[PDB]
Amino acid sequence: AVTGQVDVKLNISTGCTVGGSQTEGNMNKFGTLNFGKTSGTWNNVLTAEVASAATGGNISVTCDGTDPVDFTVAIDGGERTDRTLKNTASADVVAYNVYRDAARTNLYVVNQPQQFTTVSGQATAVPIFGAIAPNTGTPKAQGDYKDTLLVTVNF
């Protein structure tokens, strides 16, 4: 019998809120990274942007304050922690990655707070640009591949 304590805390004072999300039960549904349909072996880098579940556009984070606030954005490694989509039925995997800029260069490194700014009376967008490498080796099995990345807007 090892009984222990867990201090719970919350500082209600002046915070920042994330728009574009829908409450899926008790977990915020931020959006979808839909690469679309594809064949077994694709030569072009498959690339799609996150579509917020609430509006359809990009996640719009706004801060409830007057002065500028510097908030951070961190995305985790997915269900299996290595950013791989898994086929619903078979065990095939599809490696992918999420970048922050339009040219697939600034990668959202696993469990890292990619910095962000937010200004007076405005909603800043959180671009989560997906990208998949060209698979010109083995044709992955037919079906639907999925993953649930947990995006962590933290301060």
Add this chain to the structure above:
Amino acid sequence: AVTGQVDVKLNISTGCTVGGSQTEGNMNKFGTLNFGKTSGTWNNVLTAEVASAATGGNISVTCDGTDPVDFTVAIDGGERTDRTLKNTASADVVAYNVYRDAARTNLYVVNQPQQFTTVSGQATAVPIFGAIAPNTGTPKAQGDYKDTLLVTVNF
């Protein structure tokens, strides 16, 4: 004068130990559930994970032996027994809950042994995922809200 007996017992043989805790005086400090800063009325479900007081990551329970032991995890209802954080100065309360899975579905029911597995030469993590409902009604007073959940790793 009602004098009575209390039998004390301890079976020293082959037990299981919880890592990630720090001994706060004579009580094991397991960790912190830090939801962060927030405004009076938040529309998004505030959500944070427990951070072990010893390492900063998740509580890592390991057992001492060779056969996989099945240990249980039970969390209580907090200081007031209804999972509410209380403002340090005023009497305002903030209802919350702790779940076991990443999607806020498998709730750690009050005083219930949520089952767990553990194999030899490995440490299993105890995910205590916090979650707070969207308060879009009354703005709670400014300040710090706290609670001390007692996590009970028992066999």
